[PDB]
Design a protein around this ligand. Sequence first.
Ligand SMILES: [Zn+2]
Ligand SMILES: [Zn+2]
Lengths: 953, 953
Amino acid sequence: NPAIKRIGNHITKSPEDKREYRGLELANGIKVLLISDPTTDKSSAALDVHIGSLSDPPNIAGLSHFLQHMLFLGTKKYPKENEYSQFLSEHAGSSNAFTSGEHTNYYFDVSHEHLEGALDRFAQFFLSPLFDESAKDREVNAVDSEHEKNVMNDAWRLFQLEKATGNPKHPFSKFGTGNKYTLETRPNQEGIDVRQELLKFHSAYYSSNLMAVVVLGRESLDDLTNLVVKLFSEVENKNVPLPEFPEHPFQEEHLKQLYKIVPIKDIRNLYVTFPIPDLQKYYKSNPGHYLGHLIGHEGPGSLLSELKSKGWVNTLVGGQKEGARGFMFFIINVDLTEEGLLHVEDIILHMFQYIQKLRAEGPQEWVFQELKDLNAVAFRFKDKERPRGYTSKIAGILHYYPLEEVLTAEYLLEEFRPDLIEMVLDKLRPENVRVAIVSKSFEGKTDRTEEWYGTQYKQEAIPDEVIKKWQNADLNGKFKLPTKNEFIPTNFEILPLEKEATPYPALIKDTAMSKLWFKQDDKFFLPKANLNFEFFSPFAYVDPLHSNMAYLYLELLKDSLNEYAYAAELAGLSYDLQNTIYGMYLSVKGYNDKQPILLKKIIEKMATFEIDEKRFEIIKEAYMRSLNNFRAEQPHQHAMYYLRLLMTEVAWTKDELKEALDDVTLPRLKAFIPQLLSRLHIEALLHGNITKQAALGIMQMVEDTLIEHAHTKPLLPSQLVRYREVQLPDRGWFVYQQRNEVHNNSGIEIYYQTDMQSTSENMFLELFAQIISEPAFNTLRTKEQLGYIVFSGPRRANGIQGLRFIIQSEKPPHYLESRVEAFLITMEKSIEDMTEEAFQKHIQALAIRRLDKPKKLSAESAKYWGEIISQQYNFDRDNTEVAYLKTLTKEDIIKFYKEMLAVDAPRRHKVSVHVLAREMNLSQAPALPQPEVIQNMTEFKRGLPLFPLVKPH
Amino acid sequence: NPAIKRIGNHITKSPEDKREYRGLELANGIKVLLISDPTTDKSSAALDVHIGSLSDPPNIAGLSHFLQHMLFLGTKKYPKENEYSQFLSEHAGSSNAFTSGEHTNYYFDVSHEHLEGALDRFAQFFLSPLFDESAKDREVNAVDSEHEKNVMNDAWRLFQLEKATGNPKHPFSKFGTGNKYTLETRPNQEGIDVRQELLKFHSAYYSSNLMAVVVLGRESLDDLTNLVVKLFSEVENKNVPLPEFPEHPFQEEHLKQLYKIVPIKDIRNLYVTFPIPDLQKYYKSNPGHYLGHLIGHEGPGSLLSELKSKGWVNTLVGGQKEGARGFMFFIINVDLTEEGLLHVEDIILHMFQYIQKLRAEGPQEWVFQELKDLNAVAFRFKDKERPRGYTSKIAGILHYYPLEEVLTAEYLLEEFRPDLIEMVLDKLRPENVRVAIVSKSFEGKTDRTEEWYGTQYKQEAIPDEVIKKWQNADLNGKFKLPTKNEFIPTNFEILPLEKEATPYPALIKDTAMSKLWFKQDDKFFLPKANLNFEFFSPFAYVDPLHSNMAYLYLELLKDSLNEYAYAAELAGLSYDLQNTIYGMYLSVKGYNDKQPILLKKIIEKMATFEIDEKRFEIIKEAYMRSLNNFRAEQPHQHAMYYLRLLMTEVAWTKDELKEALDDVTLPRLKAFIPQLLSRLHIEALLHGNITKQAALGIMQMVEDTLIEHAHTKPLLPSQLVRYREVQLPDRGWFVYQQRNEVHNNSGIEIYYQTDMQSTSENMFLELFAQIISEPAFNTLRTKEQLGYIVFSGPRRANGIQGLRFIIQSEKPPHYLESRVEAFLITMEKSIEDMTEEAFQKHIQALAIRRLDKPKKLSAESAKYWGEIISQQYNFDRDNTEVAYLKTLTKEDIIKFYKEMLAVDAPRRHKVSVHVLAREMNLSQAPALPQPEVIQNMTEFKRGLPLFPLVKPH
Ligand SMILES: [Zn+2]
Ligand SMILES: [Zn+2]
């Protein structure tokens, strides 16, 4: 075969991975991985191009990002603007893309029987895009919206600020995302045809070298091979030299700098950065990882431990940070306490003291050994990935590793390289450093402004005597290297499947204190378990005060055993502990071998907890800011939040919690804990590599610890209350209005309440949602360009359901309402006009979606956990509901729409949340009734019935 | 309701379709569609019975066909033989029926007011047919006559020859029409009684489970439902199983066969046939339509293109052909060049080469998607069909599609199935082929004759060595898939109706070169336009040589323009270009979006045309043949032809044209075109979704591009002569006599010239025509059985008019002549004794007929285009004429009759054309004068005056 330059030799894989693999290089230079999985419900492909933002013309910022958006909007072979989304939607598929500095990456998935149909329209993106003049004009608004979204985000401003602070001559300084000014306004002044610039960039850069493609489907490796050469062999090779950036954007005048930055949120952060060369070629030894593991450690003797005891820092992340081909960073970033802010200089000294300890001790082979062994274990027993993310990730890394190593490359490490470790370590020095402090105490004290986000900052040379001081950092005896990690699992035997083994979780314990659901794993066979525990107490949410305490208690508890839990987390054994509106949730995930030890330590510490006063005072302050910082979340997030508050029987607002926070007192918390724990009920799902007796033992141990240390007794059955959704009246419409003080966009959520969850009502909503799914996106975004964020879909809460719309835009909420209303009429009409096939396609699509099998334990566990926490206990819901769905008729969906959804529906139940921006041809919209505006959340709830609660099976 | 088994309310229809639909399944098994159109002037109904000639008793060919004729002739509820035809005639209605292999379809229309009366008389066809004994003896001759007109027609002989060459045991071999021998002579000899047989067949097969019914009217869906049930639920259900023909009439020994066949006309054709399975069940992917689209394609890279370039072929038809439940055909038919005839083996090689190309590429999804989307817009913007044809057609398809899917079913493709396409393509192989060659060069070299038509042929096995060469057909670089079609309409915006917009076309330009009529569509609102142009030049018809050249010129233009325009018409944009007696004629119709492009290209090529010598010689020999092939046209067609020749001032006969054809020469033609183009007037009608300024813009383009490329200057007003009619003398009778050399049947035209067209003279003539219409058919055909073809009505040429009778018959024309004379006398009494109420019935019937409103844009255009080409411009004609009609009395019509038409009218002007056959109680006929016998057409024209020409209203 002439279309193929070579066929790689094995692909090395996990011995647990039953998927089959072939690597290739096409004649035109495209690198390909083929994944055959005869099991898979969905198929996918990804194509990564080794070109991104850094290659934008200095002329037209964000052109690569704009091009990425445009490829979806039409091709020569498939010229319909939305041919691609629509095809995917009707065959159970999804798509997305992102562009970074050096890559632009495109992925989709689809029902396994439509790989080729999908792949054909996909390939066309890279052969002959239209860049339609009219689509270009509309879509420019979508990216402007991406950018608006981002302007008031601290992560994004910091991201761009770093760039605007190194060498301006350097591609690194570029604005990646782009906007209206950048992509339309500017280029129109200056007289640029942008459709031609899009066409030019595509031809210049979308070359077949520089491209890597990955395809996963049920077809054989041979069938997959033939499919790929036919579709991709005809992408033109233009031999484009791969861009390189040998010179660091941080030159000498950029080092030894201090930036003082004012954030949007009330946060207190310190960023420490060292320029380093590109360590990527050293992937087999990975010096940066070794140094990241150490600087980053959180166990006894670590940097964070001491910085925490001094009460300066709560949180630390350090390690290798990516740059581009030719440059990298090493970072040590930290959050700050009120004290910590006044001791930055000391903090950085402690940082250099730890680095000195590393130099003094020399590189440690046993540490490398441990890192290497963990990775080997992680690679073996790795969970099966969802096809979509898997093809996207492999497409990216196909540009860095030989075909044969793509799967292992960034897991397995082989070489101990003291010289490299020591070379990188030699760049982590006080000369050669950059410091950034993010605090609101810099309001008014700044002299500089960032062009693209508006970030306000000041810039100073770090005084030579300060550098000198850090250079003379001596050994601090509080800093020790970590100990042998004792949580490393050593037992991976999969216990045989029991005789009494069951396809779904079984109630194996039903006492007054405990309800234990159990299932031994019958499909994945990795040595892992998930242990889920819901703890009920009326005292966790009784009032705003108690809610606060429940939160602090668990934050304080997690903080206290962080040092101990860190070791376990590196050993692939983690936990999750958070308060809920019913009490607490605890989940332990990972290798089953040492789970009992971790769990026991957690429960022992729960029932025995001794609050340190200093930790209490610090965490309280952080929580105060956390509550305040909601003021700064996105308008669409506000809308969702207000609806939740508005539709739930009891729910405490953030202003309520905040007010109550001052009354939270150390004595009072010491009192709350034993009260919380005196009466509970525990419902649990134990699922994975465990036997019934092990499971029963685990439950009992949890119970027995709690009884022994906290004198826990059972809760009455009538105390196990669940909350209800408010019942909206036939033909009613309520509007709640609020202002977002930070963002210059509006948010809206529209909720059409339908009825209680039930097989029939579930599928009516679900199928209608499916039919309008891509049309909503296509109408409200692609055509009308209302905002970047446009969502429709089902809403499920408290056993009740409905249809929702969520939009964020610069257009007012009253206007958004009318456009969604206009859209609903267009939908009734198109359901009428569509053929019985079109209808039957959407049924089949919803079917494939609902019946998609879990690929990993956690995914299965989540399904079951959903059944348990909602008390519906419907483990076979998918077969039942899908069976019933195929029964449905184009006729059934129209009466449902007319009964519940249409503007003049007898049983329409509308509520809207309008969240105003911070300072406030197309189809025909219907006339709307005058809404009743909600003045007061409590009164609104008081004046309406509450729904029943859904019945168990 | 117990009379209705199932009721489905949805029929998926087009978004623009204003009519309303309800599907039904009756208790007796009848599938029903009702169409409610409150606006129609004509209601209609149809019934399709799923039984045809393929179910005829082996010993009585043509029974089903015969039975179809008989059902018109009387019923129990209505025993008067012509009650049905008369009723429809007196209420502006018309009826007809056809019999096919597995279908018998009956349909009528009538004044919307009289649906129930007509439907009732119609329902009876299916309850209590008389099958009158004496009616049966007469109507056999009608059938025999129908077969007789077919005997010498090449298409029918071929049709039956295919049947004669497959399995004789298969019901496919049956002769479907029947004749005197079949349905009378053989059965009497064999002892059969056919009335009994008609009755057995009717009762055995005319069962309700085998019937579909369609009713269209103004009445609501609910009234229509009651009406159909009242009249059709009483049809007995005999629970008849549907015939099934799973075995193919072509078996292994009927393949690899070659047939050499002698035509009647001088025609050279090649028929290639592949037997295939019934593909009907795959209607939603339509594999045969996909493969037909490609093999049948005419654009660059197609099979046709290569074949045409070798100078072997002119036209090509490809694709699937129906057979019956259980079997189908795939065909590739081509006409032949003198060279082509010598190169049949190579032509077929190329066919298989093209098929090979498709195998090697595999199913092309973009092609299918393109077809899908074209159908989607085709269906969206389809013209409103005439009720009669619409009911009939739908009645047919209700047998194949669920009630809800009928309107869309023959229109919308749904899923692309590459696997079926490959299943069908796999049948298109040399081992599976039949080949037929039709040419005069087999005259006297054949040894077989076909029973029913007498077709002369020879049959040979195709040598295995020839088969084996076709199997090895390799790839040919001349063949490619089509290009993406760039005529696909994109823009369907219906422009707002202008302030200065007129009900009728307005004269918006009046240059010495251009007279432009314009009207913006004010009633249909579809994104289409009709662009009509007449170009006047004296040089188009100055002499036979110049007629010939004008013809050849436009034929050659279209030939060269074909590759370009094929894609255009695939996309609902087409044109029509032909020489007229005056100058020439161009029409561009379809979606208006790309009309200017095509139109401009046509006028450009027109004015810039450079002839291909090979193309010239080929089209010339085809035109030579076509010219003398008129020898083989029907006697009644000869009749009409000579009348035209005799009655019009200047007219070239085909003998004159054929003779002058030899002097047409490449240089002479090259010289003719600029001479033709140099001086022109242009009259145009631009009607549709178009704007006054845009119309002006279109004319301008047309003129500009003529002026720029052909130096076209205006004609003089006195040059713009239209032709006049010969003026017959009072009491004169002339007979022109000729014989048909091919058909053993005679034809006749009788013309009673009255006077110049004028409101009164038009309405006298067309009211009399109305009154005598039905009686003429009943008397001369149904009663007297003179022949299958019996016609009467108005005749309009060159502004003059009169009454015509056309008859084709076994009888001599001198006899035919007295019988229409006899008829005219008994029409005199019939009107004399006609009741005053009956008279208004006819007046009302004419009224509704003339005042009936257009349903398509093109129907409206044609009505205006009529007024323009005839230079009358009476755009509100029907109102003024119908208003005058109502003034008319019995006395007035009688007065018009004895003065103009009666045997002894002082102003009777009679011409008779008698076409003799190849080899040549009752009301009494009147004594006739000796006619003057026309020896010479020129002598006759010269001895008579010429009428004036009509004044432009
Ligand atoms: Zn984006
Ligand atoms: Zn017939």
